[PDB]
Amino acid sequence: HMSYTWTGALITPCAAEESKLPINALSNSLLRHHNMVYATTSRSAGLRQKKVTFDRLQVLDDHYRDVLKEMKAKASTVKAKLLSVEEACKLTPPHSAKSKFGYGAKDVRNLSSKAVNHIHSVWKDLLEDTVTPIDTTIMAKNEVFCVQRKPARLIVFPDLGVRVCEKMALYDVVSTLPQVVMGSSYGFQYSPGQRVEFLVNTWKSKKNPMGFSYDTRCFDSTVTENDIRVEESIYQCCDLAPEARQAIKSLTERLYIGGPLTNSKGQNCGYRRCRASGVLTTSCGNTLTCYLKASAACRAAKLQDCTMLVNGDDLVVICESAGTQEDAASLRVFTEAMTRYSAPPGDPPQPEYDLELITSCSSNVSVAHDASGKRVYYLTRDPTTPLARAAWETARHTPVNSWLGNIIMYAPTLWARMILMTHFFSILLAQEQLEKALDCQIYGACYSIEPLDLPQIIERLHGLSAFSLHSYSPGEINRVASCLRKLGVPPLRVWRHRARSVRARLLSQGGRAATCGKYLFNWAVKTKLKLTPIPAASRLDLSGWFVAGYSGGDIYH
Ligand SMILES: c1ccc(NNc2ncnc3[nH]ncc23)cc1
């Protein structure tokens, strides 16, 4: 029951790959320790292949079947629609991988006759054949990190025509079903502020709170054929059109359960029998399976008054504590149960008794003060990876701007405000690119955003307090300052000096640029300006921003 079998053919690149941090005239203003930043390449795919290849054994008990029966009861209340070919086409990212059958993502988006005719033939084939394995391409992701090197993560995806068919059959399902089945435990329904509120209220709802995060080792490779068929049985509980039922059965049998792996050169690399990382159902499937295994493991470990928070493979549990020694024993039982379910741990889970010390989705709750002096909880993270990616993006244009996603998701943080906003607004000003729309990712879905709209986006997501936060925690200040010394990033006092200049330069431009100056950089002046609601903020269409997770799902809004 191997996650993969391999032929020996290499996982090949599609273009020239850079692993060393590119340097330009702007690089040193952000980061001096260049050797600490690197990008993963196909060169390390062979090491990843070794780590993800193992036998999976699964022992399923009554706690597992009981949780599954409850999940199916909630799933039976969902009604999902088929999307038309045209609706699915418009969800395709403009730079999505082209089809092998002679059309690309722009052809799909423009509803070109060639693209639409091929999508219709893929759809008909899904309805008529429920057995033939569907081909997939395997590729090494190029991702940026700071040292202390990780091998490249692998992406496995079917052809563009198939991806459009997945949207037709399952977009509405994967967007609506997880919140129905998991309720408040479904992490992707929350903005960062709502996530903090859920975590703080949950922590407070316990008499003696204890919490832990559970890291499954290579989660996608732990997902078995049983798990994927169980996911399909949950999807089939929905009220669906008969064609959607048939397409979901076909896609499960031909694609989701497994299939052959083809490199960028057309050679057969081997065969997958675990979760594909580049399909529409990756996020929803991972979330449901992680929630199912963890809920059942909680019952096996007799954890009292468990509240879970799940985002794909990322899991955090807050429960009633039985004292440190009993909690340590309980987590070993929780881990044993997770292992029996084929979700063994990476790092063993640790009980935490301070909410601020729990890391989940690489983030933690912290405290600052608003303009009135009131204590305010907000979400932050270690800034090392955001700063290493910002250094890369300073010298190279990338298909996804992590700096922009980081400013959006972490707008109230000390590091996103002082460093990211200051650095990137300086660059955009110099290039007169404040109005140029840039792609970013929010919960795996792709958005095209103009930097000039950031004050309005931040107000809607975090409130006006994100422009007024001060008196950050000594723990948070020290982690930021320590990260800066590690990477050779100038200290926060330099950033404050640079921000007064960026602020003045934006105010000089007038209009939307002046709004950025006023709101984003009010922290940089001695005599702060009274910040009032932005009229443009109410008109913004942010409806599908925090609805569901779509990592690897090829979704554009
Ligand atoms: C709440 C939960 C999870 C996170 N993930 N971290 C992120 N960092 C950068 N860009 C992002 N886009 N979508 C998420 C995300 C952030 C907040």
From Swiss-Prot:
Subcellular location: Host cytoplasm; Host endoplasmic reticulum membrane
Start and end residues of each RdRp catalytic domain: 209-327
UniProt cofactor note: Binds 2 magnesium ion that constitute a dinuclear catalytic metal center.
Named cofactor requirement(s): Mg(2+)
Annotated function: RNA-dependent RNA polymerase that performs primer-template recognition and RNA synthesis during viral replication. Initiates RNA transcription/replication at a flavin adenine dinucleotide (FAD), resulting in a 5'- FAD cap on viral RNAs. In this way, recognition of viral 5' RNA by host pattern recognition receptors can be bypassed, thereby evading activation of antiviral pathways.
Subunit comment: Homooligomer. Interacts with non-structural protein 5A. Interacts with host VAPB. Interacts with host PRK2/PKN2. Interacts with host HNRNPA1 and SEPT6; these interactions facilitate the viral replication. Part of the replication complex composed of NS2, NS3, NS4A, NS4B, NS5A and the RNA-directed RNA polymerase embedded in an ER-derived membranous web.
Protein name (record): RNA-directed RNA polymerase
Native species: Hepatitis C virus genotype 1b (isolate BK) (HCV)
